[PDB]
Amino acid sequence: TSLYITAAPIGAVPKFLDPFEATFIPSFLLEGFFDADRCASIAADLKTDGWEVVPAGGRLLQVGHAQPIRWTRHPPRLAAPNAAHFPKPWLAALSNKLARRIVLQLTTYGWIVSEQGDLLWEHERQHHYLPPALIEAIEKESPALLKNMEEAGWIACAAGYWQAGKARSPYLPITPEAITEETIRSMRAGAAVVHLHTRDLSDRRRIEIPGLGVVTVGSQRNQIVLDDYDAIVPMVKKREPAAILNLSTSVRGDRHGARSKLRRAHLKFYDDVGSAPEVASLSPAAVVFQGGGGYDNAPDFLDAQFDHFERVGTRPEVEVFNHAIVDNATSLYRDRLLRTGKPVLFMLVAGVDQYRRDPITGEVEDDSLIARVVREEISSLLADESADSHRRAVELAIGQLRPVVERLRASFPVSKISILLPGPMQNLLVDVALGLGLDGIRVGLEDGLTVNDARVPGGVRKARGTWEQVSLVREELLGRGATILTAAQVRDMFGLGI
Ligand SMILES: [Mg+2]
């Protein structure tokens, strides 16, 4: 059965990282150049922005970065511009796990893999830091590598604060302009539908630290930003009118927003475009992440959502986070879902651990589509990094999902079902989707920040963008003999935007 790709370029969780910014702040600058409370307040802000305290033992490579106050008289100029790189044999000296650790960190900082599998940094400035734990691992596995790095200008550091960029990407789009650009690139790479979030950047600010420059903090909080969509919707459709926009109505990060009209205020007729958004998310039960941060979807709220979607001509995409949603969608909300138009759309949020809470006792229990114990087994299998364990993992995933797909298709014979998986589980994505006879596959920085790349040791790096993940999933699908639908084909067969 033919497939359409959904691109999900922004999401709620990951953050943008500027690879030009300092990634390490030594404690001596913070404690020496500010008084006790100002030093303490900055530090708290760094922790809020994901910086972590590290002891001495790290390495810092810096070029053209610091302004004057191994410094001289001025920061060290031990590294000549454009000279820094990690030749493939440097990384091939390491175990798979350690090589991957390094590549993942440097590609978070904007380094790229060449066609020769070298790691390159293609700019004339940087302030890139590796923590003591990593340097220790390298010194144990390959003392010679560390000496090569030091000779290239990787310099020992004291204690301080490290911006690892965990769950960050230098390619995450968080502005209307960046989101429009990525939306268009993902479509050109082959995505038929683009699933969007916006972010509130109103709290961003620059902290200036002498002997280092400026570090930028801010929540980048997931928020439905009406002015951003007022920009994005026409900006996209002036260039690509075929765009099938699927707007998040989620209030992840903000549970108090879950009853508000705001959750449908971006689902309006956009005059500049002559249309409402094609698709928007709808979850017919509370979404309670085992990891925290969920949001309710109350029956009265849902009634209002359905009325609104029907009125403006937006097709719900049912976000199947949990078994509660399957139960509810196939029973009480069945006829309401048919009213909003056929085919009814579903997205299996597979691989993400979920609770269901008992209203009476307040106790929670597992409600995941892939039961947590099974999900945990799958993760363990994927960690074996073997064909034999991968095959077992696919069986387990398929085994858990098959009854869910059968129930959805039994209740909704005219339906389209897609799947997503979190980044570290995505090697299963194609096998699982094809194995289940699904109509679609979703990828993007919302779900995972990485891609496989056999050219580089360790085999894994940060994606260059959602468009790249789209490109790679499209290529794998085509190679398996699959048919990929275009936006224009998806619009027609789904009867969307009408
Ligand atoms: Mg989303």
Coordinates of all heavy atoms in Angstrom, one line a residue, residues 6 49 52-53 102 124 138 141 145 152 158 201 243 250 257 264-265 334 353 358 363 420 478 493:
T6 N 4.9 12.4 6.4 CA 4.7 13.6 7.2 C 6.0 14.1 7.7 O 6.8 13.4 8.2 CB 3.7 13.3 8.3 OG1 2.4 13.1 7.8 CG2 3.7 14.5 9.3
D49 N 18.6 26.8 31.2 CA 18.8 26.7 29.8 C 19.6 25.4 29.4 O 20.1 25.3 28.3 CB 19.5 27.9 29.2 CG 18.9 28.4 27.9 OD1 17.7 28.8 27.9 OD2 19.6 28.3 26.9
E52 N 25.2 22.4 32.3 CA 25.4 21.6 33.4 C 26.8 21.8 34.0 O 27.8 22.2 33.3 CB 25.2 20.1 33.1 CG 26.1 19.6 32.0 CD 25.7 18.1 31.6 OE1 26.1 17.2 32.3 OE2 25.0 18.0 30.5
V53 N 26.9 21.7 35.3 CA 28.2 21.9 36.0 C 29.2 20.7 35.7 O 28.8 19.6 35.8 CB 28.0 22.0 37.6 CG1 29.3 22.0 38.3 CG2 27.2 23.3 37.9
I102 N 31.3 11.2 20.2 CA 32.0 12.3 19.7 C 31.3 13.0 18.5 O 31.1 14.2 18.5 CB 33.5 12.0 19.3 CG1 34.2 11.6 20.6 CG2 34.1 13.2 18.6 CD1 35.6 10.9 20.3
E124 N 35.2 30.0 10.3 CA 36.4 30.5 10.8 C 36.4 31.0 12.2 O 37.3 31.7 12.7 CB 36.9 31.7 9.8 CG 37.1 31.2 8.4 CD 37.7 32.2 7.5 OE1 37.3 33.4 7.5 OE2 38.6 31.8 6.6
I138 N 38.3 9.1 25.9 CA 39.3 9.2 24.8 C 40.7 8.9 25.3 O 41.4 8.1 24.6 CB 39.3 10.6 24.1 CG1 37.9 10.8 23.4 CG2 40.4 10.7 23.1 CD1 37.9 12.2 22.8
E141 N 40.8 5.1 25.7 CA 40.8 4.3 24.5 C 41.9 4.6 23.5 O 42.5 3.8 22.9 CB 39.4 4.5 23.8 CG 38.3 3.8 24.4 CD 37.1 3.6 23.5 OE1 37.4 3.5 22.3 OE2 36.0 3.5 24.0
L145 N 45.1 9.8 20.1 CA 44.0 10.7 19.5 C 44.0 12.0 20.3 O 44.0 13.1 19.7 CB 42.7 10.0 19.6 CG 41.5 11.0 19.2 CD1 41.8 11.5 17.8 CD2 40.2 10.3 19.2
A152 N 46.1 20.0 17.7 CA 45.3 20.9 16.8 C 44.7 22.1 17.5 O 44.0 22.9 16.9 CB 44.2 20.0 16.2
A158 N 39.6 24.4 33.1 CA 39.2 24.2 34.5 C 37.7 23.9 34.7 O 37.1 23.6 33.7 CB 39.5 25.5 35.3
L201 N 9.3 33.0 21.8 CA 10.7 33.5 22.1 C 10.8 34.8 22.8 O 11.8 35.4 22.8 CB 11.5 33.6 20.8 CG 11.4 32.5 19.7 CD1 12.4 32.7 18.6 CD2 11.7 31.1 20.4
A243 N 0.8 22.9 -0.2 CA 1.1 22.5 1.2 C -0.1 22.0 2.0 O -1.1 22.7 2.0 CB 1.8 23.7 1.9
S250 N -1.8 21.0 20.5 CA -1.3 20.5 21.8 C -0.8 21.6 22.7 O -0.3 22.6 22.2 CB -0.1 19.5 21.5 OG 0.8 19.5 22.6
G257 N -3.5 25.4 29.8 CA -4.0 25.9 28.5 C -5.0 24.9 27.9 O -5.6 25.2 26.8
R264 N -8.0 26.3 19.3 CA -8.6 26.3 18.0 C -8.5 27.7 17.3 O -9.0 27.8 16.2 CB -10.0 25.8 18.0 CG -10.9 26.5 19.0 CD -12.3 25.9 19.0 NE -13.1 26.4 20.1 CZ -13.1 25.8 21.3 NH1 -12.4 24.7 21.5 NH2 -13.8 26.4 22.3
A265 N -7.9 28.6 17.9 CA -7.9 30.0 17.4 C -7.0 30.1 16.2 O -7.2 31.1 15.4 CB -7.5 31.0 18.5
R334 N -16.7 7.9 17.5 CA -16.6 7.3 16.1 C -17.4 8.1 15.1 O -16.9 8.5 14.1 CB -17.1 5.8 16.2 CG -17.1 5.2 14.8 CD -17.6 3.8 14.8 NE -17.5 3.1 13.5 CZ -18.4 3.1 12.6 NH1 -19.6 3.6 12.9 NH2 -18.2 2.5 11.5
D353 N 6.3 6.2 26.1 CA 5.6 5.7 27.3 C 4.5 6.6 27.8 O 4.7 7.8 28.1 CB 6.6 5.4 28.4 CG 7.6 4.4 28.0 OD1 7.5 3.7 27.0 OD2 8.6 4.2 28.8
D358 N -6.4 6.8 37.0 CA -7.7 6.5 37.6 C -8.2 7.8 38.3 O -7.5 8.2 39.2 CB -7.6 5.3 38.5 CG -8.8 5.3 39.5 OD1 -9.9 5.5 39.1 OD2 -8.6 4.9 40.7
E363 N -4.2 7.0 41.0 CA -3.1 6.2 40.7 C -3.0 6.1 39.1 O -4.0 6.0 38.4 CB -3.2 4.8 41.3 CG -3.3 4.7 42.8 CD -3.6 3.3 43.3 OE1 -4.6 2.8 42.9 OE2 -2.7 2.8 44.0
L420 N 4.9 7.2 13.8 CA 6.1 7.9 14.1 C 6.9 7.1 15.2 O 6.2 6.2 15.8 CB 5.8 9.3 14.7 CG 5.1 9.4 16.0 CD1 6.0 9.4 17.2 CD2 4.2 10.7 16.1
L478 N 11.5 3.8 -1.4 CA 11.7 3.5 -2.8 C 12.5 2.2 -3.1 O 12.1 1.4 -3.9 CB 12.3 4.7 -3.5 CG 11.5 6.0 -3.6 CD1 12.4 7.1 -4.3 CD2 10.2 5.7 -4.4
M493 N -7.0 12.4 -2.8 CA -7.5 11.1 -2.3 C -8.1 11.3 -0.9 O -8.9 10.5 -0.5 CB -6.4 10.1 -2.3 CG -6.0 9.7 -3.7 SD -4.1 9.2 -3.9 CE -4.1 7.4 -3.2

